[PDB]
Amino acid sequence: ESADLRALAKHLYDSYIKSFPLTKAKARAILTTDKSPFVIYDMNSLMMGEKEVAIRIFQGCQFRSVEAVQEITEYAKSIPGFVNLDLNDQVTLLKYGVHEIIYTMLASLMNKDGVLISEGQGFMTREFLKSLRKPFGDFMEPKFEFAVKFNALELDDSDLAIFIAVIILSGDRPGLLNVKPIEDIQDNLLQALELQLKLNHPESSQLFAKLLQKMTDLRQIVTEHVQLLQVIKKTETDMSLHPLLQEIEK
Ligand SMILES: CN(CCOc1ccc(C[C@H](Nc2ccccc2C(=O)c2ccccc2)C(=O)O)cc1)c1ccccn1
Q1: 61 CB near ligand 1 (under 6 Å)
Q2: Which of 15, 29, 114, 227 satisfies CB 3.0 to 4.6 Å to 78 for a cystine?
Q3: 133, 156, 139, 78: which is closest to 103 by C-alpha?
Q4: In the UniProt annotation, what is the result of changing residue 18 to R?
Q5: CA distance 243 to 46
Q6: Residue 244, class by beta-carbon neighbours within 10 Å (0-12 exposed, 13-18 middle, 19+ buried)?
Q7: Residue range(s) defining the domain that contains residue 200
Q8: What total number of domains does the chain contain?
Q9: Are strands 114-117 and 110-111 parallel, antiparallel or unpaired?
């Protein structure tokens, strides 16, 4: 029954709103004047924005990634069936899905010229980020490239809540014990997302299929990021990575 798929879409949107304090809707209202962001565009304004700069920015990003992980974890528990799965598998799903979600959600805070930071209070420009040191100057560019074309789908928060749930419940992650109950949940989530996109974007042909194709882009970004992490580890032996993030990327 489609009525059941609507109730599922509503439950997940409700949980998403409860779990993620900075939504796409809020981000778009900031980026498009009730509270305008301070703009970090150069090495000078970063001072007034308030251990070299590149590393400082990187750790800021690290810090925000761990809060995102906390937030994503909370949302995952709201996905019906998720907490009933084998504990090891829950860990497995989160481990491999978390970065994908982060990048997906990071696009909501981005436009072609930059990205919102510190809960929307700031806006760090694209050029500034790209002119960083050596190994850091190119953490954020592939992010920006994905965001530009993901943001072209014009998904709103209610779409993204279902899509993020589809991502968590894959079933093709490495080392999963009981693949079949995961796939049974993803199958229900896929059904709800399909109905959601048809109702919310009726003019937007094959949006469902176009959204699923975007999972290839997320995979490569994660891959690329992990390589950079390995580069950073060895040329910055005096810099610490956060263990929650360090555990995640095995
Ligand atoms: C708390 N803090 C940093 C201040 O807060 C910031 C933390 C990070 C940043 C850079 C920026 N990260 C964000 C920061 C705030 C809000 C959103 C983002 C997103 O870009 C984001 C979201 C998820 C994952 C990664 C990035 C970036 O990496 O593009 C700017 C500011 C520190 C860091 C070191 C020492 C002391 N105090």
Answers
A1: yes
A2: 15
A3: 139
A4: More than 50% loss of ubiquitination
A5: 27
A6: middle
A7: 1-250
A8: 1
A9: antiparallel
**For the residues of 55-96, what is the DSSP string, one character each?**
HHHHHHHHHHHHHHHHHHHHHHHHSTTGGGS-HHHHHHHHHH
Technique behind this structure? Answer: X-ray
Ligand 1 center–CA 206 separation, angstroms = 35
Of 112, 96, 72, the closest CA to residue 172 belongs to: 96
| Nearest alpha carbon, ligand 1 atom 3 | 60
Rounded CA gap, 128 and 112, in Å?
Answer: 13
Q: Which residue has the tokens 């004047």?
A: 33
Q: Which two tokens stand for residue 7?
A: 């109730």
Do 63 and 148 contact (CB within 8 A), yes or no?
A: no
User: Resolution, in Å, please?
Assistant: 2.2
Amino acid residing at 63: F
Pair 23, 157: CB distance under 8 Å: yes
* Atom nearest to 116 CA in ligand 1: 17
Nearest to 147 by CA among 182, 113, 186: 113
Return the amino acid letter for 16.
Y
